C-alpha cells in the first residue's frame, strides 16, 4: 500500500576473467590473478602445448 | 520424454491403470526451465536440457 | 512510453533506466511568478527528475 | 668477414604436410641457432597471423544474447560460443568482410556446413560443427558478419555504433595456428658432429597451409629485423 507502480529492470553482466579476480582450488589455495599471459610466453612441454 | 526445448521439457509419465483411474491429470507433464534468474548474491541460475 | 529502458539496450554508466518525474514544489504563486509564466511560458513546468 | 665462416643452412625441407599438419626441417645449423630460430618462429606463429572469424550475429526473434530461440535446444549464449569456433578460409581474392544471411529449416541440427550455400567469398573448414539443435519444424533466419583480423578481439571492440537492432557483438579469435612444436637434434657435417637440425611441427586450423604460415612468420621477423640496418639508426 501507498505505492502506485513498481518498475523493475534486470541487467545482465557478462564478466570474463580479468586481472584482480580471485581464484581458488579445493585445498585452501587461493590467489588473485596477477597477470594474463599470452600463449607464446607460457611454459610449454616438449609437444609444444 | 515428448518435447525438449531451451524453455521447456515435456515428458509422458507412465502411470498404472488404477492410478490413471484415480488421477484427474494427464500423464504428460511440462517443466519450465529457469532462464537467467538472479540469486541473492547476484549470480545467475541458467538451466539447459 | 512508460519511461522504461528497452530489452536489449546497453546500460553504459549514467544512462537512464527508469525515467521519472516528481511534482516539484510550487510555493504560493507570487504575482511576479504569475506574470513571468504568463509572458515567457511554462518552460519550468512543475516536474523534477 | 668474420661472419663468413658461419655454416649457412640450405633451405627449409618439407617432410610431410597436409592442409592441417606439417613437418619441416632446417639444416645445417650452427650450435645454438636452432633454438633462436625456432623460438622466434613459434612466437610469431602463435601471436601474429591473420585469419577470418565472425564478429557479429543477428538472429530473428532474438533481442540480446541472454535470450532463447523458441524451439531450439541451445540458448543464444551457447549458439554464440559455437559460432566462435566456425573457421573460415579465403575462396575469392580481395575480400575483407562479408555479411551472410542464412535461412535454415526442416533439419534436426543446424551445422556450420549449412552456411556454405549462403557464403560466396569464404569456405567453412569445419562443416561438421554443431551450431545448434532444432526441431524438425523450427526455422532459423540469422545473419553473421565475417571479418579479418589478427589475434583475439573482444566483443567491446566489435560493437558497431551503426549496427541494426538485435546485433550482438561476438568475441573474435583470428589465430589460424593451433600448435607449434620444435626440436633440436645433432647434425653431422663432414668431420664435425656438433651442428644442429631444427625440426618443426605446425598444426593449423586449415585456413593457412603450414608452409605459408612459416613464410608469413619469417616475413614478419625479417620486416622487424630490417629496421636494424645502418640507414635506419639515428
Q: Which residues contact D83 (CB under 8 A, 6 or more apart)?
A: D54, D57, D131, D144, D170
The Cα–Cα gap between C40 and C25 comes to 20
Does A12 reach chain B within 8 Å, measured CB to CB? yes
Report the phi/psi class of residue B33: left, alpha or beta, with left for phi > 0 and alpha for psi in -120 to 50: beta
Report yes or no: D186 and D30 within 8 Å, Cβ to Cβ.
no
Q: Would you tell me how many other CB atoms lie within 10 Å of the CB of residue D84?
A: 15
Locate B24 and state its grid cell.
484427474
Question: Do chain A and C touch: 3 or more Cβ pairs under 8 angstroms?
Answer: yes
User: Which chain A residues have a beta carbon less than 8 Å from that of B38?
Assistant: 10
What SS3 state is found at D67? coil
Report yes or no: D57 and D81 within 8 Å, Cβ to Cβ.
no
The Cα–Cα gap between D172 and D83 comes to 10
What SS3 state is found at D23? strand
The Cα–Cα gap between C11 and C15 comes to 6
Containing C37, the helix (H) or strand (E) segment is helix C31-40
The Cα–Cα gap between D164 and D98 comes to 15
Report yes or no: D88 and D124 within 8 Å, Cβ to Cβ.
yes
Give the pairing of strands D109-111 and D152-153. unpaired
Give the pairing of strands D130-133 and D140-150. unpaired
Q: Dihedrals φ, ψ of D47, to 5°?
A: -105, -40
End-to-end CA distance of chain D: 25
Does C13 reach chain D within 8 Å, measured CB to CB? no
Report yes or no: D13 and D27 within 8 Å, Cβ to Cβ.
yes
Report yes or no: B9 and D72 within 8 Å, Cβ to Cβ.
no
Locate A13 and state its grid cell.
553482466
The Cα–Cα gap between D201 and D14 comes to 10
Report yes or no: D85 and D126 within 8 Å, Cβ to Cβ.
yes
Nearest Cα neighbor of D54 from D94, D82, D20, D74 is: D82
The Cα–Cα gap between D151 and D145 comes to 17
What SS3 state is found at D131? strand
Report DSSP state, residue D72. B
Q: Which residues contact D196 (CB under 8 A, 6 or more apart)?
A: D27, D28, D29, D30, D31, D32, D33, D34, D184, D185, D186, D187
Edge-to-edge strand order for the sheet containing D11-17? D11-17, D21-29, D192-204, D177-189
Report yes or no: D56 and D98 within 8 Å, Cβ to Cβ.
no
Report yes or no: B33 and B41 within 8 Å, Cβ to Cβ.
no
Locate D99 and state its grid cell.
555479411
The Cα–Cα gap between B44 and D83 comes to 23
The Cα–Cα gap between D234 and D228 comes to 11
Locate B21 and state its grid cell.
483411474
Nearest Cα neighbor of D113 from D137, D143, D88 is: D88
Does A15 reach chain B within 8 Å, measured CB to CB? no
Question: Do chain D and A touch: 3 or more Cβ pairs under 8 angstroms?
Answer: yes
Report yes or no: D180 and D12 within 8 Å, Cβ to Cβ.
no
Pick D74's closest partner by Cβ from B3, B6, B35: B6
Q: Which residues contact D227 (CB under 8 A, 6 or more apart)?
A: none
Q: Which residues contact A11 (CB under 8 A, 6 or more apart)?
A: C11, C17
Containing D45, the helix (H) or strand (E) segment is helix D33-47
Does A12 reach chain C within 8 Å, measured CB to CB? no
What SS3 state is found at B19? helix
Task: Give the distance from residue A19's alpha carbon to the nearest chain B alpha carbon, in angstroms.
Answer: 20
Locate C42 and state its grid cell.
511554462
Q: What is the resolution of this structure in A?
A: 2.9
Q: Would you tell me how many other CB atoms lie within 10 Å of the CB of residue D58?
A: 18
The Cα–Cα gap between B27 and B1 comes to 11
Task: Give the distance from residue A19's alpha carbon to the nearest chain D alpha carbon, in angstroms.
Answer: 16
Amino acid at each position: 500500500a501507498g505505492i502506485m507502480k513498481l518498475a523493475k529492470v534486470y541487467i545482465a553482466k557478462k564478466r570474463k576473467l580479468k586481472v584482480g579476480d580471485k581464484m581458488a582450488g579445493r585445498h585452501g589455495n587461493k590467489g588473485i590473478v596477477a597477470r594474463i599471459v599470452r600463449q607464446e610466453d607460457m611454459p610449454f612441454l616438449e609437444d609444444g602445448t | 520424454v515428448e518435447y525438449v526445448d531451451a524453455q521447456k521439457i515435456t515428458i509422458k509419465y507412465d502411470r498404472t491403470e488404477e492410478e490413471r483411474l484415480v488421477s484427474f491429470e494427464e500423464d504428460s507433464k511440462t517443466y519450465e526451465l529457469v532462464k537467467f534468474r538472479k540469486t541473492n548474491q547476484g549470480t545467475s541460475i541458467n538451466l539447459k536440457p | 512510453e512508460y519511461g522504461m529502458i528497452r530489452i536489449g539496450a546497453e546500460v553504459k554508466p549514467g544512462d537512464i533506466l527508469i525515467g521519472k518525474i516528481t511534482p516539484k514544489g510550487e510555493s504560493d504563486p507570487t504575482p511576479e511568478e504569475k506574470l513571468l509564466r504568463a509572458i515567457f511560458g511554462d518552460k519550468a513546468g512543475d516536474v523534477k527528475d | 668477414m668474420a661472419l663468413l665462416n658461419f655454416q649457412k643452412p640450405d633451405k627449409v625441407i618439407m617432410i610431410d604436410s597436409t592442409d592441417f599438419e606439417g613437418k619441416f626441417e632446417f639444416r645445417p645449423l650452427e650450435p645454438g641457432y636452432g633454438l633462436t630460430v625456432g623460438n622466434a618462429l613459434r612466437r610469431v606463429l602463435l601471436s601474429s597471423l591473420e585469419g577470418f572469424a565472425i564478429t557479429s550475429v543477428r538472429i530473428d526473434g532474438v533481442e540480446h544474447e541472454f535470450s532463447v530461440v523458441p524451439g531450439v535446444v541451445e540458448d543464444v549464449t551457447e549458439i554464440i560460443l559455437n559460432l566462435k569456433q566456425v573457421r573460415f578460409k579465403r575462396q575469392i581474392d580481395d575480400v575483407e568482410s562479408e555479411t551472410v544471411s542464412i535461412s535454415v529449416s526442416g533439419k534436426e541440427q543446424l551445422t556450420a556446413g549449412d552456411f556454405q550455400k549462403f557464403i560466396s567469398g569464404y569456405q567453412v573448414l569445419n562443416p561438421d560443427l554443431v551450431i545448434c539443435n532444432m526441431g524438425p519444424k523450427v526455422s532459423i533466419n540469422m545473419e553473421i558478419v565475417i571479418e579479418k583480423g589478427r589475434g583475439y578481439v573482444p566483443a567491446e571492440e566489435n560493437k558497431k555504433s551503426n549496427a541494426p537492432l538485435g546485433s550482438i557483438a561476438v568475441d573474435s579469435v583470428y589465430t589460424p595456428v593451433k600448435n607449434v612444436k620444435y626440436s633440436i637434434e645433432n647434425y653431422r657435417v663432414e668431420q664435425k658432429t656438433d651442428y644442429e637440425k631444427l625440426v618443426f611441427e605446425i598444426i593449423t586450423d586449415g585456413s593457412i597451409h603450414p608452409k605459408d604460415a612459416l613464410t608469413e612468420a619469417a616475413k614478419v621477423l625479417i620486416h622487424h629485423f630490417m629496421l636494424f640496418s645502418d640507414e635506419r639508426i639515428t
